[PDB]
C-alpha cells in the first residue's frame, strides 16, 4: 500500500472521511444516518475501483488505443454518477433536517 | 486545484456519450433510470424511501458503467478466446445483474409498503 | 470454497434480516449493504482476472490494481458493519 500517499486519494478520501464524521454527529434517526454514511462511502468505493481499472490500462502500456480511453472515461462516468448520488442523498435527507 | 475536477468532468461526459452512442440497450437502460428517478421525485413517500428508490437505480447505472469499463479493457487486450477474458466478463456481468435484481426488488418492497 | 462461503454469508444475513422483526426500510438497508459487498467483490475479482490475463509476472501497476480493488472491498465491508451496528442498535434501543 503506497497509493494512500498520493494527493488525489488524499483529497477524495479526506472529503469522504469528513462527511462520515459529520454524519456521525448529526441529530438524525438511524436510517438517515446510515444513508448519509453509505452514499459517501460508495463514492470512495467507486473511486478506488476506477483507479484500479486505470492501473490495469496503464499496465498494458503507453501506446494509445481507443478502448483504453473508453475504459478510463467509463470509469470516470461511474465516479460522477456516484458523486451525484451522494449529493442528491444529502440534499434530500437534510432539506428535511433544515429545521 | 479544481482543474482535476474539470478534466474529470470531461472524461465522464465522454464516457456517458460513448456508452449512449454505442448501444441501444444502454440508451433504453438510461431511459428506465431517468423514468425511475422522476417517478421517485414525484411520489408521495418519505425522504428515506425516496432516497432508496433513487440510489437503487443509480447503483444499477454505476455498476453498468464499471462493468463496461472492464469489458473495454478485455476487448483492448484482444478477447482472443481466453479463459480469464471470459471469466472477467462473467464476473462483471454477474455484478450488473445483482444490482438490477436488487433495484427491482427494492422498488417492489417499497411500493408494496406504500400502496 | 472461497466464493461459496460468501453465498453462505448472504443467505445467513438474509435469514437474520427476515428473522428480525424490522420494517421494510431497515430490511432493505440490511440486505442492500450485504449485496453491495457482493457486487464489489465480483468487480474486484474481474479486475484480478484481467491483471492475470495480461501476465502473472509482477509489475508495479498490477499490484497497484489489485491493492485498489481489495481496498474497495474493504470499504464496502466496513460500510456493511456500520449499517448493521447502527440499524440493530436502533432496533434494540
Ligand atoms: C456538509 C457536506 C455536504 C455534502 C455531502 C455529500 C458530499 C459527496 C461527496 C464528496 C466526495 C468528493 C471527493 C472529492 C473528489 O471527487 O475529488 C475529485 C478528484 O480530485 C478528481 O481527480
Ligand atoms: C440545483 C439543482 C439540484 C439541487 C440538488 C438536488 C435537489 C434534491 C432535493 C431537493 C430537496 C427536496 C424537496 C424539498 C423538501 O424536502 O421539502 C420538504 C418535504 O418535501 C415536505 O414533506
Ligand atoms: C438526477 C440525475 C439522475 C441521473 C441518472 C443516471 C443517468 C445515466 C445515464 C444517462 C446518460 C445520458 C447521456 C446522453 C448522451 O450521451 O447523449 C449524446 C447525444 O447523442 C448527443 O448529445
Ligand atoms: C408522465 C410520466 C413519465 C414522465 C417522463 C419524464 C421524462 C423521463 C425521461 C426522459 C428521457 C429523455 C431523454 C434523455 C436523453 O438521454 O436524451 C438523449 C439526447 O436527447 C440525445 O438524443
Ligand atoms: C426534476 C426531477 C428529476 C431530476 C432530479 C432528480 C434528483 C433530485 C430530486 C428528486 C427528489 C427531490 C424532489 C422534491 C421532493 O422530494 O419533494 C418531496 C415532496 O414533499 C413530495 O413529493
Ligand atoms: C421496477 C423498476 C425499477 C428498477 C429499474 C432497473 C432498470 C434496469 C434495466 C433496464 C432494462 C431495459 C429496459 C427495457 C428495454 O430495454 O426495452 C427495449 C425493448 O424492449 C426492445 O428494444
Ligand atoms: C438476490 C438478491 C436479493 C436477495 C433477497 C431476496 C428476498 C429475501 C428476503 C427479503 C425479506 C423477505 C421476507 C419478509 C419478511 O421477513 O417479512 C416479515 C414477516 O412478515 C414477519 O413480520
Ligand atoms: C472502532 C470503531 C467503533 C465504532 C464502529 C461502529 C460504529 C458505527 C457508526 C458510527 C456512528 C456514530 C453515530 C452515533 C450512532 O451510531 O448513533 C446510533 C443512532 O443513535 C441509532 O442507534
Give the CA diameter of chain A. 55
Q: Which CATH class is domain A1-99?
A: mainly alpha
- Contact yes or no for A44/A13 (Cβ under 8 A): yes
- Contact yes or no for C50/B84 (Cβ under 8 A): yes
Q: How far apart are CA A19 and CA B6, in angstroms?
A: 22
Residue owning the nearest CA to atom 22 of ligand 3:
B17
Choosing from A6, A47, A54, A63, the catalytic residue is A47
C49: its cell numbers: 482476472
Alpha helices, H only, C1-93: 4-19, 24-54, 60-92
Q: How far is CA A7 from CA A52, A64, A77, B79, C31, in A?
A: 16, 26, 21, 35, 35
Q: How far is CA C85 from CA A33, B80, B92, B100, B113, in A?
A: 12, 47, 30, 26, 24
Q: How was it solved?
A: X-ray
B28: its cell numbers: 433504453
Cβ contact C33–A30 (<8 Å): no
B16: its cell numbers: 456517458
Cβ contact B62–A50 (<8 Å): no
Q: How far apart are CA C63 and CA A71, in angstroms?
A: 19
Q: How far apart are CA A23 and CA A21, in angstroms?
A: 5
Which residues from chain A sit within 8 angstroms of residue C25, using beta carbons? Answer: 31
CA A11 / ligand 1 centre spacing (Å): 8
**Active site includes A47?**
yes
- Contact yes or no for C91/C22 (Cβ under 8 A): yes
Nearest ligand to residue B22 Cα: 3
**What letter does residue B81 receive in the DSSP assignment?**
S
A79: its cell numbers: 465516479
- Contact yes or no for B74/B89 (Cβ under 8 A): yes
Q: Does domain C1-93 have CATH number 2.102.10.10?
A: no
In chain C, whose CA is at the least distance from the CA of B48? C25
Q: Who contacts B52 (Cβ-Cβ below 8 Å, separation ≥6)? A: A35, B106, B110, C25, C28, C29
DSSP characters for B33-55? HHHHHHHHHHS---HHHHHHHHH
Q: Who contacts A96 (Cβ-Cβ below 8 Å, separation ≥6)? A: B47
- Contact yes or no for B14/A78 (Cβ under 8 A): no
Ligand 7: list residues with CB < 6 Å: B 101-102, 105; C 14, 18, 21, 27, 31
Closest approach of C8 to chain B, Cα-based (Å): 16
Nearest 5°: phi and psi at A75?
Answer: -65, -50
User: CATH second-level architecture of B1-115?
Assistant: Orthogonal Bundle (1.10)
Give one word for A27, left, alpha or beta, with left for phi > 0 and alpha for psi -120 to 50.
beta
Q: How far apart are CA B86 and CA B89, in angstroms?
A: 5
Contacts of C8-16 with CB under 8 Å at 24 or more apart are C9/C34, C10/C34, C10/C35, C10/C38
Q: How far apart are CA C87 and CA B1, in angstroms?
A: 38
Nearest residue to A95 (alpha-carbon basis) of A46, A13, A36, A41: A36
Cβ contact C49–B91 (<8 Å): yes
The total number of residues shown for chain B amounts to 115
Q: How many other C-beta atoms can be found within 10 angstroms of the C-beta atom of residue B36?
A: 18
Amino acid at each position: 500500500a503506497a497509493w494512500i500517499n498520493e494527493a488525489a486519494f488524499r483529497q477524495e478520501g479526506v472529503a469522504v472521511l469528513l462527511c462520515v464524521v459529520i454524519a456521525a454527529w448529526l441529530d438524525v434517526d438511524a436510517v438517515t444516518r446510515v444513508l448519509l454514511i453509505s452514499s459517501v462511502m460508495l463514492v470512495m468505493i467507486v473511486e478506488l475501483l476506477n483507479s484500479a481499472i486505470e492501473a490495469v490500462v496503464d499496465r498494458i502500456g503507453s501506446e494509445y488505443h481507443e478502448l483504453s480511453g473508453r475504459a478510463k472515461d467509463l470509469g470516470s462516468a461511474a465516479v460522477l454518477i456516484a458523486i451525484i448520488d451522494a449529493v442528491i442523498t444529502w440534499a434530500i435527507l437534510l432539506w428535511s433536517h433544515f429545521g
